[PDB]
Amino acid sequence: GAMDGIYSASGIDVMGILLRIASRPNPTIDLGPLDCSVSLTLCDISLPDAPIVYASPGFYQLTGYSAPEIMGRNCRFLQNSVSDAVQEMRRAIRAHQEVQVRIVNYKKNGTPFTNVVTILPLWADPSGHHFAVGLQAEL
Amino acid sequence: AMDGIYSASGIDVMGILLRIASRPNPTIDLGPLDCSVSLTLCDISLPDAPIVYASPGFYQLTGYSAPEIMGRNCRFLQNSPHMPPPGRVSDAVQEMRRAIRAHQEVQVRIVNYKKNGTPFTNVVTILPLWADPSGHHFAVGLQAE
Numbered sequence: 618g619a620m621d622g623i624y625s626a627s628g629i630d631v632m633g634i635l636l637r638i639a640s641r642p643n644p645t646i647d648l649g650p651l652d653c654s655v656s657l658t659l660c661d662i663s664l665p666d667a668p669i670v671y672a673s674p675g676f677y678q679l680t681g682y683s684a685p686e687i688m689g690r691n692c693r694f695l696q697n698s699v700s701d702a703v704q705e706m707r708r709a710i711r712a713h714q715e716v717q718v719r720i721v722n723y724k725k726n727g728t729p730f731t732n733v734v735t736i737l738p739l740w741a742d743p744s745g746h747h748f749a750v751g752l753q754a755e756l
Numbered sequence: 757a758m759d760g761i762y763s764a765s766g767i768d769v770m771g772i773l774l775r776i777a778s779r780p781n782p783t784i785d786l787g788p789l790d791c792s793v794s795l796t797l798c799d800i801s802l803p804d805a806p807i808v809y810a811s812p813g814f815y816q817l818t819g820y821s822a823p824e825i826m827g828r829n830c831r832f833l834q835n836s837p838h839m840p841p842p843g844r845v846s847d848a849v850q851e852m853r854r855a856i857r858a859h860q861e862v863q864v865r866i867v868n869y870k871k872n873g874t875p876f877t878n879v880v881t882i883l884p885l886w887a888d889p890s891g892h893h894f895a896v897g898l899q900a901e
């Protein structure tokens with residue numbers, strides 16, 4: 618039992634999330650391949666204002682932020698050092714629909730980028746937690 | 757087309773992991789994995805099983821960089837330039853060797869050396885893949901201190 622969870626330092630089971638992605642009915646977006654450098658956030662929609670409960674190394678690398686600086690915050694801070702992508706994401710998330718947009722975001726140093734953002738709200742799990750996954754990519 | 761914007765290497769590592777997760781007759785329970793996991797992918801149909809991909813977690817765990825380790829066999833991790841040669845060879849090495857050869861899952865613990873010479877008890881798990889559209893067999897390794 619000393620090896621329980623040694624392959625997730627966060628104790629988050631991202632692979633559980635991957636399984637949900639693959640199992641979703643009526644998938645509308647194909648992610649294509651993901652590797653371990655992927656920018657990825659998990660937000661708990663079951664908590665008020667969809668706070669970040671996990672971000673991959675790839676997200677920190679993309680944005681220049683660190684864990685204490687972003688954990689527990691809504692992803693919208695990325696939009697500031699407004700776009701119709703914002704409302705497209707708001708509405709999709711509300712309907713629990715998959716959505717993909719391009720939108721201008723900003724790294725910690727204030728540098729703007731065009732971020733290709735995919736959000737899969739997925740679903741509330743029997744515990745009631747509701748992990749939404751977002752993937753980011755600088756184009 | 758947005759295909760491949762979420763894998764700069766082109767490789768579907770996470771599709772690889774998912775297949776693994778749901779494999780029949782598992783022998784080891786991997787447990788939870790996150791995106792920091794140290795991971796190597798080796799093409800064992802190519803001479804001396806070269807690394808064709810290592811995760812950010814692998815470079816963070818071991819201290820090497822991509823161009824230092826790509827194309828190389830993973831055994832360099834058993835070597836510190838600042839240790840004396842071994843007669844004391846771990847059973848871990850043979851177990852890995854024999855498992856790889858039989859396309860068998862295997863999990864051992866063994867001493868490796870970060871690039872700065874520090875030993876760590878690496879818990880290495882090696883899993884087999886099926887022949888890719890290539891006809892090539894791969895092995896996925898998961899490392900962790």
Ligand SMILES: Cc1cc2nc3c(=O)[nH]c(=O)nc-3n(C[C@H](O)[C@H](O)[C@H](O)COP(=O)(O)O)c2cc1C
Nearest residue numbers: 660691692693695696703706707734749750751753
């Ligand atoms: C899992 C997840 C990841 C998200 N990632 C991003 C992102 O990378 N960039 C961004 O601008 N918005 C992202 N968002 C969108 C914002 O968090 C927010 O939902 C958006 O601004 C619409 O809501 P609002 O009108 O209240 O601000 C993400 C949302 C979720 C649920």
Ligand SMILES: Cc1cc2nc3c(=O)[nH]c(=O)nc-3n(C[C@H](O)[C@H](O)[C@H](O)COP(=O)(O)O)c2cc1C
Nearest residue numbers: 798829830831833834849852853880895896897899
């Ligand atoms: C995917 C993969 C990952 C491996 N990862 C490690 C590792 O992290 N540490 C280690 O000491 N050996 C690792 N090995 C083992 C060596 O690469 C090699 O197979 C082992 O030393 C046995 O072969 P040998 O007797 O020729 O040295 C890995 C092998 C494979 C195929």
